[PDB]
């Protein structure tokens, strides 16, 4: 809202971010998959579809206005200017924070709360991506021998679980081959 | 609590490394997968289960 | 009337009721749409949606209150999301 508002060039939308851990061990620099996770989901969904979200939230607005309506209705029983620009005021921005919610519940934390979407998953389809959207994967690639190891593991097995279509790899970019290793 | 305190403040066990993860190797990949996993009693340890991970039980 | 609680407390009551003939039109429209699996899975997804939808409100009018009013400040909303003054 607010690269729109300001006009600034929006150069992607950061769908994702996420950190993690290994396990126990007594090796520190070795890599490990503690960011698998961002791929947990549980496999033993209408939430995962955008037209049903769409409707949620379009009767979750409708809600919100009837709302509006009766809480200005209200205000109206209730510096009579002063107070009514002021009772407004509130009316409006609240009225705004309910429809902001809906949004973020029904359009960008839809998958939160649910264990069926991961992380990775529900990000994609906050734009309605699948999995096989992400077309390159920006390898950290640090030509170490365990870590293209097992960061080529973790990618890989996160794209499996996550139902990537087979034949469908993610392209490799391995910037560290030319800029180095900062 | 209380108990934990007293037998690690004399017997000098406060800080006791863990040797091993939760889940075993073979297991730690569908743990990291599974948003439902949790570790149960086995062998007086809490560990990963085969069985707990993916199950419908959780979900 | 933001920074008073009964004020909140009733905005949410009503928002819960919403919430729950919300549940119940799901469940109805489930109705009619391996059916026992089906239907397990369904209800656990009407079930997790009626429980955010009651999380967020709450989050919202007990939580949040203040995140978006200037005239709360985030000290004072802070105290306030318990009934406490900055006194």
Redesign the interface.
Same mark, same amino acid.
């Given at each position: 809202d607010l690269a729109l508002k300001m006009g600034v060039p929006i150069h992607a939308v950061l769908a994702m971010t996420a950190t993690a851990t290994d396990?126990?061990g007594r090796s520190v620099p070795a890599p490990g998959?503690?960011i698998?996770?961002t791929?947990?989901?549980?496999?033993? *969904?209408?939430?995962l579809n955008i037209k049903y979200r769409k409707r949620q939230l379009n009767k979750r607005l409708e809600?919100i206005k009837s709302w509006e309506e009766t809480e200005l209705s209200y205000l109206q029983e209730e510096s009579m200017h002063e107070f009514l620009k002021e009772?407004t005021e509130?009316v409006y921005?609240?009225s705004?924070?309910?429809v902001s #919610?809906a949004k973020?519940?029904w359009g960008n934390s839809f998958y939160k *709360? #649910?264990?069926?979407i991961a992380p990775l998953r529900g990000a994609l389809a906050a734009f309605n991506l699948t999995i096989d959207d992400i077309g390159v994967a920006s390898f950290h690639g640090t030509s170490t021998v365990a870590n293209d190891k097992n960061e080529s593991a973790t990618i890989n097995?996160?794209m499996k679980?996550l139902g990537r279509s087979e034949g469908n790899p993610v392209f490799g970019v391995f910037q560290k081959y030319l800029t180095g290793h900062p | 609590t209380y108990r934990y305190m007293h037998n690690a403040i004399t017997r000098n066990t406060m800080f006791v490394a863990k040797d091993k993860a939760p889940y075993s190797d073979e297991l730690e990949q569908p743990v990291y997968l599974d948003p439902l996993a949790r570790v149960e009693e086995n062998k007086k340890k809490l560990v990963f289960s085969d069985k707990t991970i993916q199950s419908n039980q959780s979900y």
């Amino acid at each position: 809202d607010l690269a729109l508002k300001m006009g600034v060039p929006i150069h992607a939308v950061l769908a994702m971010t996420a950190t993690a851990t290994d396990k126990i061990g007594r090796s520190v620099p070795a890599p490990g998959k503690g960011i698998l996770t961002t791929a947990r989901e549980h496999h033993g *969904s209408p939430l995962l579809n955008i037209k049903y979200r769409k409707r949620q939230l379009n009767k979750r607005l409708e809600q919100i206005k009837s709302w509006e309506e009766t809480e200005l209705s209200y205000l109206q029983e209730e510096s009579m200017h002063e107070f009514l620009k002021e009772r407004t005021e509130e009316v409006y921005r609240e009225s705004k924070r309910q429809v902001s #919610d809906a949004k973020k519940q029904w359009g960008n934390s839809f998958y939160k *709360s #649910d264990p069926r979407i991961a992380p990775l998953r529900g990000a994609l389809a906050a734009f309605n991506l699948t999995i096989d959207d992400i077309g390159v994967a920006s390898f950290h690639g640090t030509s170490t021998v365990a870590n293209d190891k097992n960061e080529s593991a973790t990618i890989n097995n996160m794209m499996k679980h996550l139902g990537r279509s087979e034949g469908n790899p993610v392209f490799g970019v391995f910037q560290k081959y030319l800029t180095g290793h900062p | 609590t209380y108990r934990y305190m007293h037998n690690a403040i004399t017997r000098n066990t406060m800080f006791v490394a863990k040797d091993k993860a939760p889940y075993s190797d073979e297991l730690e990949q569908p743990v990291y997968l599974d948003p439902l996993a949790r570790v149960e009693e086995n062998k007086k340890k809490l560990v990963f289960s085969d069985k707990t991970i993916q199950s419908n039980q959780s979900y």
